[PDB]
A paper describes a structure:
Here, the crystal structures of two permuted halves of a modern ribose-binding protein (RBP) from Thermotoga maritima are reported.
RBP-CPN was designed to consist only of the βA–Eα1–4 elements, which are directly linked to α9. An alternative explanation could be the formation of an interface between two crystallographic dimers, as indicated by an analysis with the PISA server. The resulting extended arrangement is facilitated by an interaction of the βI strand and the residue stretch 116′–120′. The r.m.s.d. of 0.5 Å over 135 Cα atoms of the resolved residues, however, indicates a high similarity between RBP-CPC and the corresponding elements of full-length RBP. However, it appears that RBP-CPC, which still contains this corresponding helix 8, does not reliably form a dimer.
Numbering used by the authors:
A (entry chain B): 1 to 97, 115 to 142
B (entry chain A): 1 to 95, 115 to 142
Write the structure that this text describes.
Amino acid sequence: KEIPYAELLGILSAQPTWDRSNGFHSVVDQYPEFKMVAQQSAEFDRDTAYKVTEQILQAHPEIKAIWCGNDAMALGAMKACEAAGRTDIYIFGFDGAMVGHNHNYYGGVLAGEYFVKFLKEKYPD
Amino acid sequence: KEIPYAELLGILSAQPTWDRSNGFHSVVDQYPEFKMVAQQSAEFDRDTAYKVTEQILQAHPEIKAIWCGNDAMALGAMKACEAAGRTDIYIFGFDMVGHNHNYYGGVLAGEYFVKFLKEKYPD
């Protein structure tokens, strides 16, 4: 039933962080089977994402996926999963590159659609 | 030895959030005994802070203090601490090439946070 996941946020003071995450959540939050059990900044950085993911894996072992606000954080997350033997966890991300929406928000929307479609196929009810 | 704490940030897209937090950290980060174990927006909102703090207290029972980017969040955090029986936790709050008023308010709040907590928890 439930698909628990974690999210790695970018730098909290940087607008791309909010736009990517908000776009992602505009989609994923419509599918209540997806449960965000952890959400933390990894500062758009690979080494920080490794450290943060290592901690998330210990506190929330049930996660099936991690969505990341840039490629560097996804790479660090993937390394941490490998180091923990958690090669089962799926890693996703969007790297980019106010009234209305922009590039980072729409990219988060499309990334969220893919995240839902992929994970509902792997983990149907 | 160490003094773990949590920070409740304002609305992430609002510049006062960052001026206040950056001024606070310009002081606190110089003192290595203070360790920020959780940092999360509570949207400058009391009821959001209540819910966010309830979650932080369960993930990070080691915390001895919470610093908040406005009064509304401090009040929500205080209520959450009471609800969890954690009346031991101290709550604090305050309500770009140059520096501005919110930054200097954060600096003064951080100086007070350090002084107060170092008197409560001396080496």
